[PDB]
Ligand binder design. Structure first.
Ligand SMILES: Cc1cccnc1-c1csc(C(=O)Nc2cc(Cl)cc(NS(C)(=O)=O)c2)c1
Ligand SMILES: Nc1ncnc2c1ncn2[C@@H]1O[C@H](COP(=O)(O)OP(=O)(O)O)[C@@H](O)[C@H]1O
Ligand SMILES: [Mg+2]
Length: 855
């Protein structure tokens, strides 16, 4: 499209030239001929292979707080006292609690129970152990208890502190709350969880800490201090952080052979892990399972006499089935889930007349919420006959526990669940399974910066373990919604995350923990990542100045490594602190770790939701506005909060988690030397002119880069690549069917590129051309009249202004490096550097680009 004109005032034009002359930067001269455009865009230490240090549990050391015990009963108490005190407390609890006895009886029926003696024997004599058994035997909930009680009953409760790693956030919290119940406790006594931005630490001795691997790695700066056993759960799922930890722990096992690693896996080939850990023993666990009659899409269409509404493996069909079964299946698009058939399959399950729950496997939040409303709109699937419980990570823990509840007699329990119900948790009374045969994976391509949340085909392993969910109670049934032809064009195993995930967050961990070369360390992985991913990670971190030319951790990189956030968002927060808008930026950063706090239900945003935006045309401004209004409503107590959150249609749980995350991000910046006065909550207006919010949007543009786009007409936008895309339906910038939005700038930075039959941009914020050139661009080529931004945008703007705004970028990044050496210096900055920040504040203003949002 034709270049967008930028109306820079003459006063601003000269101010930019002044500060560049004061900063001792030259204006790169124009090109001799417009044909050749000039580009305006402008330690000696090494590490060796070291091991993470280890030490066993002490009496006076708290492993969770990583501190000494000076005051309290266990201050200077002996290991022998503690051992008896905890034993006597447990032995008294068991005989005085008839409710705990009933629970302790349920435990001793679990298939894993009859292997207890063997597991304890293996772990006691061998460093590393693999506990292999079918999903639902009780590996996760019982093994850590067997190990703890074995030390308690034998008067060694002081010599036991267990770490249990889980792949998912909800697994670590659920299991903590479940094992707590199984000991008649709440989390905080002998059982605790530690996840990103949430923790209930357990007691200092005879304790189990359930956690995500990410948390554990961030706490290993000091080393594995005061831990006897490290249990790595659900290794078969091949979480990238789990794979990485197994590299770290194998080095720990070798240097400190007294430590006790315990790997626990579903029914897969564990030779790869066995060989990796020096041919360690494999304890086989198993209970009674029933043969499950497995059906494919052909069987499902024939048994139900189904007819769909008005390469592809549906066009291929077995010749042993009926003619109409062939013709019906043909009309089903395999890149959809057959919603109407699942509804018809539920009806068939009734006709069989054998009471049991139906576990439906769907990919992601989107298709489960679609399946739910689809059913409930049919009165037949009401409370009278049916109980439809959704099961994904983003549900409240109130509703996640309701899947385990028995239902009233003559009612069917249908679980619309994700891959969480595959191997992580087992549901009881499951006789029926409907497998969509799909997975939702986070595929990232760094060349165009596309976050592809794609629905892809599951493996034979997945189908085999999804089938196994039906055969725990009685002879079950599994309904695969994939052709017999498709089952052949399916892989044996899924691509492990290590092969298809960005490694820059693992690369910082490697350097922070001082484990040597990024490539050197990652070469020791059980299945090393692709070369191009390691090169990309090293390049990305060198660009941010997180690493130097020798690939060693800079003072900036050290901060980014300690922040549990995308390194680029980490740098955005550091810059926020220099501009004294740290709190706002910490809020924005935190918000990216949780779902949108707005309850939309799929439909476009109403008045209430859009009113938070103001005149800024920003989902990010809307989010900050919600937090300013919600934080005020909190002062009226817990009930006033619930009334505000329900009146405005906000997820109160999401706002609380985000705020707690913001406080923890703020905490790490303080500990890094940043002053508190640059992180104080500041009042702002989302309609009136506000210079603090102008800067916040500028630093936002830096953060989400290279997610920039240009608006065409209606919902159509063109991306960084120069390809057409759509404004997401959930955005405040998304118009209604008719009324076209007159945007005062066609430019937008945004959060992520959700791919669904097209390119859609979610979490959109309006930016001015000055912000584009300053923070939201790398390559800028000028021909004297027209500048070319990243070879996809042309601006009819002054050559001197473009070179000067590009000057400020380099000046700003130069200041960040100087600030990260001693963050205290942001309070007392050089007069020239304060004048450079004031000039960034100036071009941040809408007025500086000839725009008035009020009009
Ligand atoms: C609340 C508080 C007050 C003071 C200090 N710290 C915390 C805290 C918040 S979260 C947390 C944690 O996650 N600690 C933690 C987890 C894991 Cl998984 C292991 C180990 N111990 S170690 C390194 O492995 O020896 C330790 C501690
Ligand atoms: N929150 C819970 N509510 C009810 N039962 C549960 C809960 N968590 C686990 N269980 C039960 O514990 C048993 C084993 O669970 P788990 O330890 O996760 O097994 P594994 O890790 O071997 O697959 C199952 O019968 C399951 O139903
Ligand atoms: Mg398990």
């Amino acid at each position: 499209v034709e270049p967008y004109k930028v109306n820079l005032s003459q006063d601003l034009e000269h101010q930019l030239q002044n500060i560049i002359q004061e900063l001792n930067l030259e204006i790169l001269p124009p090109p001799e001929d417009p044909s050749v455009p000039v580009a305006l865009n402008i330690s000696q230490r090494q590490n060796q292979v070291g091991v993470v240090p280890w030490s066993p549990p002490q009496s006076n050391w708290n492993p969770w707080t990583s501190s000494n015990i000076d005051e309290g009963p266990l201050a200077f108490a002996t290991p022998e006292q503690i051992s008896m005190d905890l034993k006597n407390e447990l032995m008294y609890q068991l005989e005085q609690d008839h409710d705990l006895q009933a629970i302790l009886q349920e435990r001793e029926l679990l298939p894993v129970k009859k292997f207890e003696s063997e597991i304890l024997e293996a772990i006691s004599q061998n460093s590393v152990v693999i506990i292999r058994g079918a999903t639902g035997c009780g590996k996760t909930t019982q093994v850590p208890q067997f190990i703890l009680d074995d030390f308690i009953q034998n008067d060694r409760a002081a010599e036991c502190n267990i770490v249990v790693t889980q792949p998912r956030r909800i697994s670590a919290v659920s299991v903590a709350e479940r094992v707590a119940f199984e000991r008649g406790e709440e989390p905080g006594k002998s059982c605790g969880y530690s996840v990103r931005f949430e923790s209930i630490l357990p007691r200092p001795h005879a304790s189990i800490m359930f956690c995500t691997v990410g948390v554990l790695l961030r706490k290993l700066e000091a080393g594995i201090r005061g831990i006897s056993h490290v249990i790595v759960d659900e290794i078969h799922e091949r979480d990238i952080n789990t794979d990485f930890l197994l590299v770290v722990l194998r080095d720990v096992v070798q240097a400190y052979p007294e430590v006790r690693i315990v790997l626990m896996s579903a029914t897969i080939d564990t030779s790869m892990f066995c060989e990796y850990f020096f041919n360690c023993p494999i304890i086989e666990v198993y209970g009674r399972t029933y043969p499950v009659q497995e059906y494919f899409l052909e069987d499902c269409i024939q048994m139900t006499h189904f007819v769909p509404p008005p390469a592809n493996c549906n066009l291929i069909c077995g010749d042993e089935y009926g003619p109409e079964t062939r013709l019906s299946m043909s009309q089903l698009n395999e890149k959809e889930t057959p919603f109407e058939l699942i509804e018809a399959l539920l009806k068939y399950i009734e006709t069989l007349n054998v009471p049991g729950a139906v576990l439906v496997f769907l990919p992601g939040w989107n298709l489960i919420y679609t399946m739910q409303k689809h059913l409930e709109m049919n009165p037949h699937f009401g409370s009278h006959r049916y109980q439809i419980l959704p099961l994904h990570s983003q549900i409240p823990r109130e509703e996640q526990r309701k899947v385990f509840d028995p239902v009233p007699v003559g009612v069917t329990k249908v679980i619309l669940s994700t891959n969480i119900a595959e191997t992580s948790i087992t549901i009881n009374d499951v006789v029926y399974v409907i497998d969509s045969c799909k997975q939702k994976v986070k595929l990232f391509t760094a060349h165009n910066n596309m976050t592809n949340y794609a629905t892809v085909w599951a493996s034979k392993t997945n189908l085999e373990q999804r089938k196994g969910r039906a055969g725990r109670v009685r002879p079950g049934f599994c309904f695969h919604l994939c052709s017999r032809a498709r089952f052949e064009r399916l892989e044996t195993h899924m691509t492990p995350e290590m092969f298809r995930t960005p490694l820059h967050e693992i690369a910082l961990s490697i350097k922070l923990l001082r484990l040597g070369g990024i490539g050197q360390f990652l070469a020791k992985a059980i299945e090393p990542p692709p070369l191009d991913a390691v090169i990309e990670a090293e390049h990305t971190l060198r660009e941010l100045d997180a690493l130097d030319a020798n690939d060693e951790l800079t003072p900036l990189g050290r901060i980014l490594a300690k922040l549990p956030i995308e390194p680029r968002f980490g740098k955005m927060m550091i810059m926020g602190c220099i501009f004294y808008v740290g709190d706002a930026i910490c809020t924005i950063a935190a918000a990216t770790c949780f779902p949108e706090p707005f309850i939309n239900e799929g439909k476009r945003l109403g008045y209430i939701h859009r009113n938070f935006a103001g005149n800024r045309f920003s989902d990010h401004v809307a989010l900050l506005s919600v937090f300013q209004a919600w934080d005020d409503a909190r002062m009226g107590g817990e009930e006033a909060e619930i009334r505000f959150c329900e009146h405005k249609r906000l997820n109160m749980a999401t706002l609380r988690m985000t705020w707690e995350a913001k406080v923890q991000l703020k905490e790490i910046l303080i500990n890094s030397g940043f002053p508190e006065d640059c992180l104080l909550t500041q009042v702002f207006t989302n309609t009136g002119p506000d210079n603090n919010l102008d800067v916040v949007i500028s630093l936002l543009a830096f953060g989400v880069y290279p997610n920039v786009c240009y608006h065409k007409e209606k919902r159509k936008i063109l991306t960084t690549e120069g390809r057409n895309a759509l404004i997401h339906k959930s955005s405040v910038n998304c118009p209604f069917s008719s009324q076209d939005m007159k945007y005062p700038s066609p430019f937008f930075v945004f959060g992520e590129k959700i791919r669904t039959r097209a390119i859609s941009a979610k979490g959109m914020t309006l930016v001015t051309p000055l912000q584009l050139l300053l923070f939201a661009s790398k390559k800028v080529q000028s021909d004297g009249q027209i500048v070319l931004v990243d070879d996809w945008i042309k601006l009819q703007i002054s050559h001197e202004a473009a070179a000067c705004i590009t000057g400020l970028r380099a000046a700003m990044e130069a200041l960040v490096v100087e600030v990260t050496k001693q963050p205290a210096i942001i309070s007392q900055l050089d007069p020239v550097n304060e004048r450079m920040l004031n000039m960034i504040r100036q071009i941040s203003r809408p007025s500086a680009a000839g725009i008035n949002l009020m009009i």
